[PDB]
């Protein structure tokens, strides 16, 4: 509910160990939801973009909200990927997460590839929203689904008594409009952890990030700053945070933090096919920029075992 | 096999016929394929973009593939619509398909949302043309993909001796590049209509259109002017069919295209959700500049039945 | 200097009034000036952008700097645009800018319409510094030049002892860049009213603004709650502040503004061609978004007097 | 007049030879223009982009027109740039070239910087239009100017009986519309000499080129080939072209040509700042590319003397 996440600031976008045979790696879970809670993770989203959704089967997310469902045991409230550019799968799959429970709310992207209209995306989730008990977060990202939901559309959609935030990636101009206009109940995020600064000065709740796996105390650091009325240290925080971010991103996420948590020991191991990991000079590189450490010593993406 | 979509100038991506209450209408699928017979089409791709793809499960796919085959009979050569997002699943179904049998080719789309680095598309590829019998042509389309392959990545690929083509989205530049330094046994189609004209002049192989389903004769006297020296009378059809070309994407396809089909009377019906039919007022400015059509008057997206 | 220019928070980049036979209006500058001084301007820009610099010959602009000094009395620092597109033509004018003397500093754009590289802009810059004992503020606009000073190339040239500003339009990453980076005796400034938010937050020195003209008050209402520590005052007038800045935008420059003042009663008058002024229309829009005002009703550009 | 150019396939926009001290290089001229006439340039643009005519004086322009003249002596008709982003400047300067004499038509330019409104370009051309006997062609570069003329602009424009013309700079799909919908006695080129094998096949009447200082055989060959129904022969001709037109720019132009035409002897000498001599590396793969030469052995770009 919207009440669950009102409180949330830093909502970190999991990622999904894997084995080097390619299947989910279930022991590494444990460790990794441990770090985020002991890093100022405030509520964690699952199987989203970060968490390379696009690989994993409906069937295996349900078996990784179980586990980390285990593990968090209500610590923090938990969102679930739920959408697809396919509006019946995201119908079936958004009415099994409500089934299975656990979750204070379900995310639906922005559909990808087939490139919709704003009538289409209204009706897209229009459809899941009316689908389950399960409030949905509609995720804006034009950056990887070239389309993007205008804020009118956005606004229309935020008057659904069942959709209660947004993941929006695009301008600050777009997300001050959305701040000044939301209707109530209706959480703002941004998806830019590049922007997160920007985003809270302007009044946004919080970010959906990738970069809280690894820099988590910096953006509590910076957060605390901006709530505590100490811009000065907040805006030192964000100009030494922006070339981290860049670093995250300078190969295909979320090869970059992986790359970064099998470093800090954390077991992340490869991505899944198309995506490859970070080749070795990268590594280095990215490791050095994002949390100081010194790394030492052809790439393999992996397939879902077909057995 | 190449020799089998060697002759091809204008492949047709076939659109999925729907009934009104959102399943397959398998019965409009032989008036439909005659149309395109009767009119230049001299192969087809099934399940593209314009077949909507993204809203058709695999099984799906297969019953088109069998209703087409039972029709086509073998006339022209077919093209499979093989590749998604996802690797593992890509694969699955390409050897399906290859067991399935009786097309020439499997069509692989550069991956979606996920935006992989080049390594990562020429191992998603690989794998795909390692899987099966059925040879790949590649589809790049950063309109749709964001990400490209870039030629270099491309002529990489092109080396391997099961994949036989592309079906380029890119630009003029690229596609010239890309015929010179072609290898012996690879096909160059342009998958955009606007730049057929061009492509063909540059050298390339064909077409695989939208605007074959509405404007197959055109597109045939265009090509046939191309080919027997008649540039003028080429440039002459080009000049006139850019405009429609534009109509025809003037709202997210398929849905001018359908909405054309239907007021010719072929029961294209509906689009699946998240893309909805084209908006009322279009639908007549559309029938008017693309087939030069008188159109006598909210819209609904539907859904795969959940039962 | 440095030193006359380092408490500036809100720089107006002066308008040039013209009469309706094309010349300027010199009558209309010492009340247009006042009402700035009067609406918390701390600085003023002579012959930028928004004064219609590029139809005003080197002479009339030493007319208008004498003019504006006049009425202006020392009260307030001011910058003189002096840079064009060529080198030659850059160095003779701030020479003679120099010998007039009255000015803070002089404002030099990156090249237009030729497309320099980052050795040109280099070499640009480092000779119009060299030329005079004006201090230099450089001009970064891809939106009006294409090109960019990347922020390695911008920080080489703040090495320059006569290099004392820079007045950045890219990107809010550029800015934070910057002001990290930054070497001592050089001034940040934003060229983006609609940025000054952010730009304040980050740690910019202040803003060169069009908005300043009709806008004044609350952007000073906004800088004070930023620097009172009262961020929630700040981010409500922002949100409200960006329609009113892309108002002001929604024809070319300056004919909204001019628009807006001559409804205030300025007589700013026309634009010089190729700049028309803003359709009737717009004019009724924009005065309603921008000062909340009531406007009671073919656009003319007019010419310098052959005469 | 039209007539006069007509039949023109291949204008050349001529480089303005440079001194090392920074004067013009008037010595250097006919050497130069007899290279052109002995390699298909059957027309030649005076004082365009390619000339550098941002740092050249209007008198300088006058001294070059002269110069050129006297050497070309009515072989080819000449175009004179006459247009800069002033109007008034414009209309004074097309009058002294109109009285000047000896051309057959004045380019004028998209005004670059002040991005006018599509009412502003009108109206700036209508004047220029006016001001003169010299018939006036359109030059539309957004990728230099940033705004550019929409087709239906440009059409109004050339219904004026003294607009002949237009250097289209754009896309080919503009290209097609302004071929089909253009009224009489009115020209279309394209500027983009990579685009030059469509713009005929099209129905464009020829190429305002750069490359044709370098390669005027090869871009004759094609065009012949085209005009005499060998498409096989113009396309193995334009796919081994481009990548010769993106080595000419790939350094700010006119450097790269400059360095070929030094490398040929014909002391084209160095840029005038802001732009700068292409670096020796660049010079050396740039020679390879381009004209299939070995090139042998900081920058410094030159000032109009001040004295
Ligand atoms: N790979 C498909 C299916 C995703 C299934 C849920 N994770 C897609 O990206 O849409
Ligand atoms: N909607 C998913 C699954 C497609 C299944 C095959 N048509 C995607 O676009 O990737
Ligand atoms: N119109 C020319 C000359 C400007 C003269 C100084 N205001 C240019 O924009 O470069
Ligand atoms: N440098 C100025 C003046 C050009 C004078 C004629 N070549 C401009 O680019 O507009
Ligand atoms: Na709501
Ligand atoms: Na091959
Ligand atoms: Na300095
Ligand atoms: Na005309």
Same mark, same amino acid.
Do not use: C, R
């Given at each position: 509910s919207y009440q669950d996440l009102k409180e949330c600031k830093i909502i970190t976008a999991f990622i999904t160990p894997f084995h080097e045979d390619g &299947?989910? !790696? +279930?022991? /590494?879970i444990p460790a990794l939801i441990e770090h985020l809670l002991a890093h100022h993770t405030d509520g964690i989203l699952l199987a989203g973009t970060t968490a390379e959704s696009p690989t994993l089967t409906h069937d295996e997310e349900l078996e990784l909200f179980a586990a980390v469902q285990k593990v968090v045991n209500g610590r923090v409230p938990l969102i679930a990927g739920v959408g697809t550019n396919d509006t019946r799968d995201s119908i079936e799959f958004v009415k099994e997460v409500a089934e299975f429970g656990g979750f204070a709310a379900g995310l639906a992207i922005? @559909? $990808?590839? !087939?490139? @919709? &209209?704003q009538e289409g995306m209204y009706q897209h989730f229009k459809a899941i929203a009316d689908a389950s008990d399960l409030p949905i977060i509609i995720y804006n990202i034009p950056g990887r689904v070239v389309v993007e939901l205008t804020p009118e559309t956005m606004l229309r959609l935020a008057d659904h008594p069942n959709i209660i935030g947004v993941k929006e990636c695009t301008s600050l101009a777009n997300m001050a409009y959305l701040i000044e206009h939301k209707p109530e109940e209706f959480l703002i995020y941004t998806g830019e952890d590049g922007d997160a600064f920007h985003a809270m000065n302007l009044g946004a709740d919080g970010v959906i990030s990738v970069a809280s796996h690894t820099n988590g105390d910096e953006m509590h650091e910076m957060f605390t700053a901006i709530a505590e009325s100490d811009m000065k240290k907040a805006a030192a925080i964000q100009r030494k945070f922006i070339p981290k971010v860049n670093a995250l991103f &300078? $190969? @295909? &996420? @979320?090869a970059p933090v992986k790359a970064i948590l099998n470093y800090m020991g +954390?077991? /992340?191991?490869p991505t899944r096919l198309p995506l490859v990991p970070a080749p070795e000079e990268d590594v280095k590189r990215i490791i050095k920029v994002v949390v100081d450490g010194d790394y030492e010593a052809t790439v393999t993406g992996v397939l879902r075992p077909d057995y």
């Open positions: &299947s989910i !790696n +279930f022991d /590494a922005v @559909p $990808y590839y !087939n490139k @919709p &209209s &300078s $190969y @295909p &996420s @979320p +954390f077991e /992340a191991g």
